[PDB]
Design a protein around this ligand. Structure first.
Ligand code: CL
Ligand code: CL
Ligand code: CL
Ligand code: CL
Ligand code: CL
Ligand code: MG
Ligand code: MG
Ligand code: MG
Lengths: 195, 195
């Protein structure tokens, strides 16, 4: 199967993390969750208090051959990612080895921009953090797929379905993305991959 | 200081549970999560494998004065609810005492219909299970609010935002629902409480 490494830190946005995980599993993707910036503790208290148990510490899975690394948002979770040298070097390694980096909400501006990971990539993120993304790189769009650098970005809790579906499309294919979308009772406006 | 009791079981649908909890917290509603696991275990494995910690076993919080009891879906989570005499008694007590019952996805057909808790009233649920909701009660709407019996129902993972926003309306009101909605970057097909 295709596989995904979903990172979690104290203060990660729980809808973004959980909805993404759920959709990837529905798509037949094996998902591992990794605890970041917790010195190995697998208990992760998210941004609105939801408490998740991660599968493993990042340091034990960072060298795995996952097809995508996923960075949920949440202000404080994204700061933890930014300030983790292991997280940043893992993101860089996924990219250099031809794999996908996927980031939502505050993660693009907080993690990718300060570390100059994708200096000329196109990206989106949470609208109120537009001023944290260099102006020439910013698109205000529910999902942005920059195929040149294999960078997938998205905007907020309410775009987590759109984000997860595009990961499925990229890793498994359009037909599987449509199958998953069809299970959800999605709002009008969200792309369902039928065409 | 409105409050919500969100029930969780092995096999609950994690998007439905977590997105609902998230939105209620954003709305200033005090949330308590209650495990309906038969042994009282609080470390719940949800339908796609997300590991979610409940705050308390149902028996320790069921008699609380929460304004709403929330039943997430997930095929096996809803079966656990149906087969828990304490859960069913608690739902009945919320209803008889003039409080709100909120249920999504499989929870209406699996829990409410077999126990005949709402013999009169409109309801929805996951559309593949529509033939398990009595025909005179069924509506095919993203959210159904029947104020006559204080029953809120909704259809699936993709309607979790609509569901959570309606709980906010019912507990805190339209202004707060609009405020929360405006945070999410949600899709155009979800009612946003602005006129
Ligand atoms: Cl441990
Ligand atoms: Cl670690
Ligand atoms: Cl670049
Ligand atoms: Cl959504
Ligand atoms: Cl399910
Ligand atoms: Mg620059
Ligand atoms: Mg394609
Ligand atoms: Mg009847």
């Amino acid at each position: 199967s295709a596989s995904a490494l979903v990172c979690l830190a104290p203060g990660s946005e729980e809808t973004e993390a959980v909805t993404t995980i759920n959709l990837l599993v529905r798509g037949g993707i094996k998902v591992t969750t990794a605890s970041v910036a917790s010195d190995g503790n697998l208990a992760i208290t998210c941004s609105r208090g939801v408490k998740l148990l991660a599968d493993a510490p990042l340091v034990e899975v960072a060298d795995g051959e996952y097809d995508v690394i996923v960075l949920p948002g949440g202000i404080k979770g994204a700061e933890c990612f930014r300030d983790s040298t292991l997280l940043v070097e893992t993101v860089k390694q996924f990219h250099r080895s031809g794999r996908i980096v996927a980031a939502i909400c505050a993660a693009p501006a907080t993690v990718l921009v300060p570390h100059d990971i994708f200096p000329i990539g196109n990206m989106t993120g949470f609208p109120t953090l537009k001023d944290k993304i260099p102006a020439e790189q910013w698109l205000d769009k529910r999902v942005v797929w920059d195929a040149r650098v294999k960078l997938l970005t998205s905007q907020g809790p309410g775009t987590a379905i759109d984000f997860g579906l595009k990961i499925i499309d990229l890793l498994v294919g359009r037909e599987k993305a449509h199958e998953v979308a069809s299970q959800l009772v999605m709002a009008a406006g969200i792309y369902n991959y039928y065409e």
